[PDB]
């Protein structure tokens, strides 16, 4: 089981040169509940973006270059990333864009958070054909004092 988890804003935008301009504690909490104990796979940029290991999860970084941090496992290719993950019920892929574009056709489940935030970014979630995916779960939330924007949690299963 290979899953992708991501927060998508308007036009599939998942990143810009800097931190997204929003504040979604509930989203990050969701991220945590659904990643905990499972191994996570990420590209180098996303690693650099987080700037610290995600605790309680085997952390795996894609990069053509040699590793620069020993608190985390570094891999040189996708098949290897998958090998580094071992025999686990479910693998979590956590970005960024280049890494999603590669793992999507190899994935059975998407954890998507939809934020109606008009934000311009050079990085996007891949285009997923709504015909290939069945939406099995959905929960919407209003913005509030702790969260800057509306967000919808969604879980998609490949038909």
């Amino acid at each position: 089981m290979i899953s992708l988890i991501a927060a998508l804003a308007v036009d599939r935008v998942i990143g810009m040169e800097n931190a997204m301009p929003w504040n979604l504690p509930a989203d990050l909490a969701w991220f945590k509940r659904n990643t905990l104990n499972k191994p996570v796979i990420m590209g180098r940029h996303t690693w650099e973006s987080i700037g610290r290991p995600l605790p309680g999860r085997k952390n795996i970084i894609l990069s053509s270059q040699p590793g620069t941090d020993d608190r985390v496992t570094w891999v040189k290719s996708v098949d290897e990333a998958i090998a580094a993950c071992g025999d686990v019920p479910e693998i979590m892929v956590i970005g960024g864009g280049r890494v999603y574009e590669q793992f999507l056709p190899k994935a059975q489940k998407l954890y998507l958070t939809h934020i109606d935030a008009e934000v311009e970014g050079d990085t996007h979630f891949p285009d997923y054909e709504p015909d290939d995916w069945e939406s099995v779960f959905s929960e919407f939330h209003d913005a509030d004092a702790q969260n800057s924007h509306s967000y919808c949690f969604e879980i998609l299963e490949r038909r």
Partner: nanobody
Amino acid sequence: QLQESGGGLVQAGGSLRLSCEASGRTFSSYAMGWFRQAPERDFVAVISWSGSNTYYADSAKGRFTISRDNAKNTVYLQMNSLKPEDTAIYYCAAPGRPHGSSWSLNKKGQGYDYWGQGTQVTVSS
């Protein structure tokens, strides 16, 4: 899939609310837009999937209001200071892509794959 309701004849300066029911998909997941055609399809207004975002054409800014009622799978276009230049057929349109995926498209009147048959709006002097 999409049925436009409301729409008839109204005197100048008059109001009139348009209605559009959409069946066949999960309503709350998709934006909804409005177009109008005069004997070329001009984009009028779009409301995002969550309702929190709205974009109005210049011809529509200030006068009109687009809103949605998920419990009734309907978007509405309220129209308030009508004039003979607004007279045309009005269509509801929906993006084929769910959520905010086609949003900048939809605001530019593109990225719509579903249309209604339209409702007539006539404004007399």
